């Protein structure tokens, strides 16, 4: 149908909106902690402690299958990548600096883009 296709349309614009947000909060890790997945290898008891592991090689998968459908999606995401990392790692641990910093710079970049996607709806 016509409609389908224009929500696609809708969609495939979010996830360009969205793969711009994502560059833009990347960047806020220069130390590529938040890079890829936690290695279960050399942190074998990850999934004991933290029960929905996040982190942006995965969040980038999941965009270019276009599969957020809103923003909202999106920042739960985000927000798993810092929440795990600020409960896994203790106060004094770069770990926990980082996600801090992260969680702080990207308030920005995230405040921003839910004014763009409300706007061009
Ligand atoms: C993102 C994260 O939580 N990393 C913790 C960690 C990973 C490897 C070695 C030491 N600490």
């Known amino acids: 149908s016509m409609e389908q296709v224009a929500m ?3 969609l495939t614009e979010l996830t360009r909106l969205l793969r711009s947000v994502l560059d833009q909060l990347q960047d806020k890790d220069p130390a590529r902690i938040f890079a890829q997945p936690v290695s279960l ?3 074998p008891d ?3 402690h933290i ?3 996040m982190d942006f090689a ?4 999941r965009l270019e299958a276009q599969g957020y459908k809103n923003l909202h999606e999106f920042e739960e995401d985000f ?4 929440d795990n990392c600020m409960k896994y790692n203790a106060r004094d641990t770069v770990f926990y600096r ?3 910093r992260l969680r702080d710079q990207g ?3 995230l405040r921003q883009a839910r004014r763009e996607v409300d706007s061009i709806g």
């Open 58 to 61: 995965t969040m980038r998968k």
């Open 41 to 43: 290898k050399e942190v």
């Open 51 to 53: 029960k929905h592991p």
């Open 46 to 48: 990850y999934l004991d």
């Open 98 to 100: 980082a996600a801090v």
């Open 79 to 82: 927000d798993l990548i810092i």
């Open 107 to 109: 308030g920005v970049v």
């Open 8 to 10: 696609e349309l809708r």
